[PDB]
Symmetry: C3
């Protein structure tokens, strides 16, 4: 039909064909001829993964040992594997092979917080630095099967460190540089990292950040860390190094030669751990394989973004998140193109920084978070007209609900109505894109991620019956019907948590945690999390971890944290706190600031609640457990719709929550 009774988003939405200028700027014949070819290849990727992914793995990856079996295992048994028997090395495929072919080709276009510190590393340069750092790590005893923590800003050293660790067959664990000391401690200890790579201080938005200081604080409780390599980012002499543990990047790398042989690893040996927050309270180390993850990165970077050897990719993200892993580092470097590594913020020295960088380097592909787009539309629209952005042809949206208005704003003010937009849906555990419009191929519906990608057999499941929904104009739980090459393989030393989270809720399926709708054309519309996970400014947060942080403050007796819509950050965190012996509304403002600072120092500045609400007690059930549902409805001004609260043990509390929120949220 033409009308939708379920997928209201899709009603009256005209398809948006790729503008003709995209093809004028495309340097070669596209990788896919048209949408009909896409659908034929997609069906083969589902019906015959062996015949589809086999040849692509042999085209796009360089193997030290051939694989004998494309695909093994099932979701239900949590034993997925790809390219069994194969051996390869990630740093060889991202660096060496390109350096041998064209050593002077740019690899890392590094834009520092202050442009005067910007520089460019060629693939040849990259090979020498990666070899030297791997040389240091090898002399420290790092070997295949070890884990190594990285705590670095988004710059050349973070990329070099990751590739040097992979060069030895060890697994890197990158810890976002905005994390607090406690967050560093939790991740380092779960992985039992033998070494850490960090720097003395950072520069962000003109400010100096305390990086090494936080490591020292965390490391007093990290007994497995034997050595730390410290890069002189500011060269501040007041930054202390602990004798016998900490060593300088420049001093140690000067001891080793600019070539070190890469270590062959099996396709299914771990490439990295990436700690993620869930509905648990403790971070879980998501583990990615080597071959399957790398194939997914190359495949999605090539086909969804339409990347060619002549192109230049600017992923405005951070390696602390999966976005930087896959689309700032592995994807582009696998394909041998330059990637722009941006250390600063979109606002410094002014709101034109993104566009100055695109123009400076003639970037052809730009990949950004809707959170930044909303900020730039609000505060920096007047900066765009100052820059020539005609080198661009593909505009990606990293992964957040994008409204049709922002889609149109992005399309008009950045793309001049001449670029293709790729709203990519995916998650840390998918490794690479799951649903996205292929640049130059798939027509767009603004706000829809469009079609599932190669190897992704998406489905909607009825939340009442657990049964897969046939046909279109449907909505339900978003699930995937078979595993795919870049799917996460386990949670580090906690495979049971992995099973309970992803494979057991809907047996036979992978559970994304999202709800979605599928319209009459088969386009998917993401409707957001069904599992109460909260994403603030593109960053996935654990409400339970924030509650635990607030409870550490001994003035607090109970804490409940929920998420709500926010026009800036997508979602915001609202914290409800009951104090032990408080009162004094003159101390309210002050005690609220103290609790926010508590979360800032325990988790990190980016997990701080938007607002802390002081209440006399929280709503609970007969069993005594907190009813967050009530807090959610109140915090979104849906006080009506609470319904029958006679089932609570303390219904009288609800009145207090409605009034406290209406009094305190503003102020």
């Amino acid at each position: 039909e033409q009308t939708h009774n379920v997928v209201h988003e899709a009603n009256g939405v005209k398809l948006r064909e790729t503008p003709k200028e995209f093809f004028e700027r495309q340097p070669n014949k596209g990788h896919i001829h048209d949408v009909n070819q896409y659908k034929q290849m997609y069906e083969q990727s589902i019906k015959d993964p062996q015949g589809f992914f086999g040849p692509l793995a042999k085209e796009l990856l360089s193997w030290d040992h051939d694989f004998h079996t494309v695909k093994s295992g099932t979701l239900k048994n949590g034993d997925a594997a790809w390219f069994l028997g194969g051996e390869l090395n990630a740093s060889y495929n991202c660096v060496d092979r390109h350096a041998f072919a064209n050593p002077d080709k740019p690899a890392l276009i590094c834009e520092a917080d202050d442009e005067k510190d910007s520089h460019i590393l060629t693939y040849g340069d990259l090979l020498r630095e990666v070899s030297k750092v791997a040389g240091v790590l090898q002399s420290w005893g790092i070997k295949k099967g070890d884990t190594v923590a990285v705590y670095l800003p988004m710059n050349a050293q973070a990329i070099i460190a990751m590739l040097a660790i992979a060069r030895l067959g060890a697994a890197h664990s990158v810890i976002f540089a905005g994390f607090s000391a406690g967050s560093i401690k939790d991740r380092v200890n779960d992985a039992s990292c033998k070494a850490l790579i960090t720097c003395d201080e950072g520069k962000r938005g003109g400010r100096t950040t305390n990086i090494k200081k936080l490591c020292d604080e965390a490391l007093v409780d990290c007994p497995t860390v034997e050595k730390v390599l410290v890069y002189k980012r500011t060269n501040n002499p007041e930054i202390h190094l602990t004798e016998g543990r900490d060593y300088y990047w420049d001093v140690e790398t000067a001891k080793f030669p600019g070539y070190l042989p890469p270590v062959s690893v099996n396709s299914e040996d771990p490439l990295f751990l990436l700690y993620t927050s869930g509905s648990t309270g403790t971070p879980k180390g998501v583990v990615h394989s080597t071959a399957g993850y790398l194939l997914g990165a190359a495949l999605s970077t090539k086909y969804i973004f339409d990347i060619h050897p002549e192109d230049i990719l600017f992923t405005a993200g951070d390696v602390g998140w999966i976005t930087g892993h896959t689309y700032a580092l592995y994807g582009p470097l696998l394909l041998g193109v330059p990637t722009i590594i941006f250390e600063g913020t979109p606002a410094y020295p002014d709101y034109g920084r993104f566009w100055q960088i695109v123009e400076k380097h003639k970037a052809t592909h730009f990949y950004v978070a809707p959170t930044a787009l909303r900020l730039l539309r609000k505060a920096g629209e007047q900066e765009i007209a100052k820059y020539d952005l005609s080198s661009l042809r593909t505009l990606g949206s990293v992964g957040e609900p994008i409204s049709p208005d922002i889609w149109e704003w992005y399309n008009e003010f950045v793309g001049k109505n001449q670029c293709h937009i790729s709203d990519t849906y995916w998650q840390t555990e998918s490794g690479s894109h799951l649903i996205a419009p292929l640049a130059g191929v798939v027509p767009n519906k603004p706000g829809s991620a469009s079609y599932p990608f190669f190897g992704i057999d998406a489905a909607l499941i009825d939340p009442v019956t657990g049964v897969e929904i046939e046909g279109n104009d449907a909505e339900g739980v978003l699930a995937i019907k078979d595993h795919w090459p870049s799917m996460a393989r386990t949670v580090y030393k906690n495979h049971t948590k992995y099973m309970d989270t992803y494979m057991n809720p809907y047996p036979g399926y992978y559970f994304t945690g999202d709800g979605a709708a599928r319209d009459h054309d088969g386009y998917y519309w993401i409707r957001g999390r069904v599992d109460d996970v909260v994403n603030v400014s593109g960053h996935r947060l654990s409400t339970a971890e924030i509650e635990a942080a607030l409870i550490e403050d001994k003035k607090v007796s109970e804490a409940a944290v929920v998420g709500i819509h926010d026009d800036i950050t997508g979602q915001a965190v609202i914290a409800y706190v009951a104090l032990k012996e408080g009162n004094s509304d003159e101390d309210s403002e002050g005690l609220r600031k103290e609790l926010v600072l508590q979360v800032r120092k325990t988790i990190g500045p980016f997990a701080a609640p938007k607002s802390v609400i002081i209440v006399q007690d929280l709503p609970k059930t007969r069993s005594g457990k907190i009813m967050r549902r009530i807090l959610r409805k109140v915090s979104s001004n849906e006080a009506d719709q609470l319904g029958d609260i006679s089932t609570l043990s303390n219904p009288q509390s609800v009145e207090g929550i409605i009034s406290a929120f209406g009094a305190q949220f503003g102020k």
Copy 2:
């Protein structure tokens, strides 16, 4: 037609394979007849490169190709096969079959009590092996380590062995009936870094103290860093030592159901198997042993993909290693792993298992057959055993009468019987009738198997005996793929035991006879000669000769390695020493005199009164007895006369 030497063979009619064997056989046999067998056998002896090369590539999956089929000689103790090759044993026994047919049964596990029986598919097995291998890998187990297994004959023993091989470490299976002292000797000789066991066992309805005996042994096993403990009974009173012992279920739950196998070289050790003198760790290679296991299981038993093998043995012995685990799993067929006894809950259990699973092949020790004949004969007829076509006898003297009983009461005179001759150090069958191919003579093992150039040797001269109707020492003229490669960290004992007694041959320690049809009849153990500069001496004859001297109270004679004369004889019992040496020369012969006669007042014996010759051997080469104090005196006494 008549035999003047091989009396066993006189008047023995050849027993052709019953027609029903071929009716039950699911496909054309692997060999048409005895003429084809002999053509293939001659190639396996004259042209091993051209014979075993193609079979190795057919039957095994390689990570790296081999460049040389065969290297080394018996005389130099440097046998090697498929040099340059790389492979993994668990990949060949599990992964490749799981990818092809994950739902095919792999381990048919019959527990002591049938209520606890279960079946693991090849897909199931891969996941369990991967998870346990993950635990061991997180503990630091890697290529070149040894890991001890002390488990009953059940799925966990099989999983443990394969998980250890998956990492390229070598497993050392310790029979679960062994005492604490027996565990300690084996763990320490191998320096195992980890141990896999269970809390308690179930045998014949009784509860056995498995973990308790391990704890007792481990107080003197400093190399064991961690222990993985399966909850076989889940008895809450079984203590786990904090920081050392961990639960199988708790740890394997942390790891995924796939873990990459580790490639090893063809000649990297697959396992140590300790023999029950001092226990010695028989070391087997990877590629050659696996090829021997698959080849003998395929051709001697006539195993096809449709078949089902029930080896009523134990992984604590080579029988379980080769024909309960590696042989059948290599060929991708199901194998029946039986934890109990032939008598529990009743004397029909063996036959109830065969009927339940429609086993096509049954392999058992004559010792078990004699028990069932004595106490449970009438139970056999109560079960449908018509799925069987091959009945194997594991390896012990089977009389013609037991052969006929086995053939009639179990096989209903419709099955082929395979009396297999082999030993721990041979890895796989040496002499056996190929099922459906070789006609039987009851009590004869028949023809040597592929790659086995068997011979009869005169025990005095070591010279090969030509022609048939002959008897002598059973010896092998060249090494073979699954031949044991060394004794762990004691290669000189290996040489002295197998290669040096009869230079140019492998010494089986057995005597045998060869009849006019070329069939071998195993005649049992020879009496342990010591080779001194080409003269073979009997320690027992020297002891007896010394004892004839009425001034002598006790005498014990032992052999030890010697760099010039090969071995030397030391006798434990200035003028009397000369008289005793002269006594041996005039009684036995001029070249039989001991290198030295040492005067001692006493030396160790056991409760049975048998002399602990091991003690003297170690003393002459520089508490467990019934008279421990005795040992002390000789530390000086050996230093006194020698």
Copy 3:
């Protein structure tokens, strides 16, 4: 015709290789004449990929193929060859020849006293190396470890080096004449986990205190967990420390005569050779190719030939031309433990005659010693099996060159004055036997892959044209070039690559005459 700069070249007649060289040669030479050499040489400079690639596949056996022949630059100190390839040095030196002909002699061992001499076939050598490697493996030695060797020039030293390489570990040979302090400095710089030595040594009849010097050094070498001690004299008064020192014979007896070799990457280190003492590091594939290539073409070695390098494995000379070079090519090599003077000054010649050696390689210092004290001894022995006479690595004056040529060579042999250094791995400039005519005192033409040049020291600019003098420098790296100084790559850059960026600095001055022949003039320091 005249030289205004290269005064050494004036009035020097070319010395064609004598006629008898080709009569004694067992097969058609590997290169026909100087013109064919210059065609091959130019390809090795212009197109190293197409020249060395095929040669690497011809002369070495690979466990994994390489994907790239050559990588890196001198200026960046990141040279690499045969990238991606895997191989094992002991497989190429032992296993593959043992399989083909196990009874062919490998180590012709002449002891300090001839009564103790013996010969190991390739089959023999595989068993002894397997057993020693089995000992080291049981001790935990693995790829990436270093093992120190403090042994005289005898079978045990060759077996130890090969057994360490068999496991993919790196051997660090310490000349048996070094003091305890010299042992300590090397052992600690390399952090060796094990040491292989002997109880005592025999040199010129005298007994040397070998284990005793080790024991003194080991008090300050905490990384050494175990020591393997060969009973060279079997002196019972030599102390072994309980729990650290073990006997070679006692431990090897426990292990079998075959052990699988361990694959290493082309650019994994094969050995550290210390020259304070700096550890020169040599790759595996590049070094081995250089060793086989120079031994084959400069010395004209054929499968039937027999090489006598009168050197010591404590120096690079024994590494490349007593062990790796000849064993790679599958020919016998003579390992001489003694001195040219004991029991008499006819020892070298009695050995050449005894084994019908075809090639002899020695330093001029020994030549000067024999000319002074043992010239009459030469005539007593039959040296008619020789055809190539080598000069290891010192300035050979025309007088010595003429004496060497007449009295040892009977004016029927070719002489190869080889110029090279520890850091070059193998010969840099040398006359190819049966190909390059000689000028006494001149090393002649650069070898394959060696693009030699002269640099004006004052200006640092490369000197065009001939009749020139200046600093000797190489313009691109070569397969056997040392890759670093152990854990001190900055000292490596400062010494070799930074003085003249874009060049490899030899530290020597040289002259190039109108024919292109090079005359080594000595250190610039």
